[PDB]
Write a protein that binds this ligand. Sequence first.
Ligand SMILES: *Cc1ccc(S(=O)(=O)N2CCNc3ccccc32)cc1
Ligand SMILES: *Cc1ccc(S(=O)(=O)N2CCNc3ccccc32)cc1
Lengths: 234, 236, 9, 9
Amino acid sequence: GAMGSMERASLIQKAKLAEQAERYEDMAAFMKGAVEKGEELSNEERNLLSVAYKNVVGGQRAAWRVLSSIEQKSNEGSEEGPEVREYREKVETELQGVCDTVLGLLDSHLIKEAGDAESRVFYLKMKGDYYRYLAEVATGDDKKRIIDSARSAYQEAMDISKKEMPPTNPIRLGLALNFSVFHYEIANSPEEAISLAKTTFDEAMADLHTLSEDSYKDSTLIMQLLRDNLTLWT
Amino acid sequence: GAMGSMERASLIQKAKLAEQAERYEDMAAFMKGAVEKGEELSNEERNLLSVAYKNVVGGQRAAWRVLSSIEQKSNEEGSEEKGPEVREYREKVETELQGVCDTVLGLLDSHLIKEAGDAESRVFYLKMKGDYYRYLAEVATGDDKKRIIDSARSAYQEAMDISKKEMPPTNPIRLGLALNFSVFHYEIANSPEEAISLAKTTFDEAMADLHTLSEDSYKDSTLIMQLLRDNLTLWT
Amino acid sequence: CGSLGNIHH
Amino acid sequence: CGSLGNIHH
Ligand SMILES: *Cc1ccc(S(=O)(=O)N2CCNc3ccccc32)cc1
Ligand SMILES: *Cc1ccc(S(=O)(=O)N2CCNc3ccccc32)cc1
């Protein structure tokens, strides 16, 4: 791979520079290179990996939704060629390739080497998320299997998080948030979504008293998004 | 090129979809494909080309400026030695920026400018040539840096000469040219007074011609005039 | 609804 | 200072 000749530490440095320059494609390539060095990632490094790919895939998803909406409008008193479909497919294929890339990193070999709850939950959450993005655009024979792949990853993460982390742990909270979004938007289970968000919020609220000011700020930030989703869902 | 098998109309269609999707790299690749079909571009197509590459190069210039600033800071007094990585990364972004500029200049030279006979098209393309040499000049430091600056000045000057002969003082292309040439003078050529003079004369001569315009023409001309004014406010 | 990524840092 | 491309629309 193109980053094989660069030092691990230089790849991390340049990932941070790329972030500052809002060059997220570069950021992701640097972090892929770092992962491929074969060593485990630190907390900070895991966050750089996630931020990079979130930005890349987020641009693609936003593009895909724009194009899908145009395509949906075309197919209805609508005037008729293949360009909209072809272009949506082009963006879809690119999105799928980025998701496959992230899943590949997770499977080779980040998850298997992750023994601490913090790292293992982080990576299983990521696995859920990138299968969820695959599910968002899926319509083939394997679409149910893609959905089940996201559900299984999120469920394993949930099970570890409940046993090993406090209810205010931000990764635990982010996981529950994202699994709730899975239930609402992907799995056609709004009531599961609402229940999970409510229980997560309430159990976190009850644990806030144990936190420092800095930890409290991170936990409440995620709780606010759980609440805002609940407000929208109910 | 990669777009050689796609119909011209399909490339234009997809450039508009890419714009909507904020996929400006794709937009630029589609418009490059469309140019390379060899036909002249319409008004709307010229604008699509310009918007696509402005967005691509704009992100690159923004990144370059961030990285340059970090690099400058690292070379201060008392600054800890952090290795070659900041310079390497700035160089990577610089090289990519230079490649996009070279690509746009190559489309203009092969063969958009030479086939552009109407004032509107010729001025548009020479303004673009000035702008992309100006972007090259922003990052230039070498034996050729004065020649890059002179290349931007020559293109802008030729555009200015045609625009003054052939277009009314409120024409938006004439206005945007004069705006960009004033930025060239202030930022590139170390000529703030030429910048200020040009912006003022442009503004005043546009003001005096607004009475001739429809409401819709007025809106466009005054939008660019406002940016002339705002630059003048800053510069004085 | 928003997911985690939507939250500013 | 702003250049032409910075204007919205
Ligand atoms: C999935 C997840 C959840 C939390 C974090 S974080 O590093 O705790 N953190 C704090 C709150 N929000 C946030 C947004 C983006 C990136 C990191 C955070 C990481 C990952
Ligand atoms: C360089 C230039 C100047 C004007 C134009 S335009 O087509 O008149 N137009 C679209 C681009 N931006 C803009 C701002 C204000 C008024 C009109 C425009 C194109 C290119």
